[PDB]
Amino acid sequence: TRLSAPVALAYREVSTQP
Amino acid sequence: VTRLSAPVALAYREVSTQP
Amino acid sequence: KVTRLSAPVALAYREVSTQP
């Protein structure tokens, strides 16, 4: 019943394969 | 047992309630 | 995705005096 707010949000990820 | 992590803001919800 | 990080404003540890 609460939500919070961060300063920044960091997703990821790399070269992936056919 | 170790950390706390103070955020920026904090948001609260609200429900209308009947008597 | 699997691991979205988030980065807070500040942390806070603590510790008392500990005996020998």
Curated annotation (Swiss-Prot), chain B:
Domain of life: Viruses
Protein location: Virion
Annotated family: Belongs to the icosahedral plant coat protein family.
Function noted in UniProt: Capsid protein self-assembles to form an icosahedral capsid with a T=3 symmetry, about 32-35 nm in diameter, and consisting of 180 capsid proteins. Also acts as a suppressor of RNA-mediated gene silencing known as post-transcriptional gene silencing (PTGS), a mechanism of plant viral defense that limits the accumulation of viral RNAs. May suppress other innate immunity by binding to host TIP protein, thereby preventing it to migrate in the nucleus where it could trigger an antiviral response.
Subunit description: Homodimer. Homomultimer. Interacts (via GW motifs) with Arabidopsis thaliana AGO1 and AGO4; these interactions inhibit RNA silencing ability of host AGOs. Interacts with host TIP.
This protein's name: Capsid protein
Species of origin: Turnip crinkle virus (TCV)
Swiss-Prot record, chain C:
Protein localization: Virion
Domain of life: Viruses
Subunit note: Homodimer. Homomultimer. Interacts (via GW motifs) with Arabidopsis thaliana AGO1 and AGO4; these interactions inhibit RNA silencing ability of host AGOs. Interacts with host TIP.
Family per similarity comment: Belongs to the icosahedral plant coat protein family.
Function description: Capsid protein self-assembles to form an icosahedral capsid with a T=3 symmetry, about 32-35 nm in diameter, and consisting of 180 capsid proteins. Also acts as a suppressor of RNA-mediated gene silencing known as post-transcriptional gene silencing (PTGS), a mechanism of plant viral defense that limits the accumulation of viral RNAs. May suppress other innate immunity by binding to host TIP protein, thereby preventing it to migrate in the nucleus where it could trigger an antiviral response.
Annotated protein name in UniProt: Capsid protein
Species per Swiss-Prot/TrEMBL record: Turnip crinkle virus (TCV)
